[PDB]
């Protein structure tokens, strides 16, 4: 009864325009509510006007040239172009323009879809470059850490407070009876701690979450039956998943 | 006979996936799907006509969303909802769906119209990419904290040098090894100014040769601003790349000899 297509265009989320090439300067003869919502204009502010008003300073002339060419050829076009809201706000317009021809092939109208793709072409790209920057920074900060621990030969370890998972420097591993590449946990260290010392170590390891620095003097018996006297100085980095940092030294020789 | 409908073509040529149903037919079936809809879903026209749009729902579809749609349709009210839908392939996508009733002049319901906008980038890729950026942001801060801790706890005389600029950072120990202020600005020249004349050239040649990335060692004397002769032993290595950073560890070996 009331054209389903007229209503489909009226109620769609897709900003849409219909122009009349037979009228001077191919003006807008229809803009749907979604278009007026995207741009901030009122119907009266866009009718009888060529769609050019969407272009501004940041608009690439090569893009305008491509559109001009396609319209003159009476050929469809898909282009991503910088356009401007009534506010002055720039946005990426994933534009589509299609000619409307009758059965004879007589050009009668032009139709368009204007999809704001700013998230894809601007936010997603800038967030992707922001993480590559942060990815290099982390690798550089790690390289600095690995250098100091190897050159200054520091027995440095990190421990995820809740998980228990550990990382161990080459020196930290040689202090205990560890393999250069074997995975370490607080349990791999506890397995070596002398029975008489086990409770104090579990006790100070739990009070790490406070963030205040501490010291732990304990003995170990290595997997090769060697009794070593250790002195550890630790501090937990507070936050979401606290990371306890510690430097271990083998104080056995002052005996 | 000659005037083709601009609206029929607008729907045909739009980038927006669109559906038209007939509530007067059993189960409110699809009576029209535009090429953009068939392109998004991977279906063929014949595979979607005469069918309720429900076939887009799957396991991950929230039943609360389906009830909101069922309710709005029954009320003959428009609806905007973000719902998990599925492509012919089985591929899950975020559908920013819109459904609107179509009423005639006497206000009689005649059709339902829709727009199905794939918003997966916004509700899924953007969210996961931010959660990923936060993670690295904390990691960077934690990696710095680890470095600052080692240099303070282990008493390390550690410095960094921007290869081209000469912009140097010194640790509190590095600063006490030379005759430096705890917060004064340090450059390779601030160090060179203290190096004994007899040693200056060996230091400058090795500093320029650092960019190779190959580690090196230097043993040189300094005379502090306080007139003290100190024997130093430095071990350095430049981190290669688009901006080389020279890392070095200085030790005061005067004590030894
Ligand atoms: C149906 C239709 C929709 C259009 N929509 C837009 C649009 O959203 N953004 C835009 O920058 N240009 C749009 N244009 C293009 C301009 O109206 C115009 O054709 C272009 O600026 C090239 O012509 P010119 O060099 O004479 O300005 C549209 C054109 C038509 C026919
Ligand atoms: C015009 C129109 C378009 C619809 N498009 C979708 C769609 O893209 N995705 C979807 O999950 N459901 C869509 N629906 C909703 C379902 O067809 C159905 O109404 C819903 O699953 C609730 O009814 P039910 O509980 O009987 O299944 C659409 C409904 C109408 C009327």
Author numbering:
A (entry chain A): 19 to 273
B (entry chain B): 17 to 273
From the publication, what sentences describe this entry?
LOV-HK is a blue light photoreceptor from Brucella abortus, a pathogenic α-2-proteobacterium that can be transmitted from cattle to humans causing brucellosis. Upon blue light illumination, B. abortus LOV-HK photobleaches as a result of the adduct formation between its flavin mononucleotide (FMN) chromophore and an adjacent conserved cysteine residue as in other LOV proteins.
In the asymmetric unit, four LOV-PAS polypeptide chains form two elongated parallel dimers. The tandem LOV and PAS domains from the same subunit have no direct contact, and their dispositions are swapped relative to the helical spine resulting in a cross-shaped dimer. The CD dimer exhibits slightly higher asymmetry than the AB dimer.
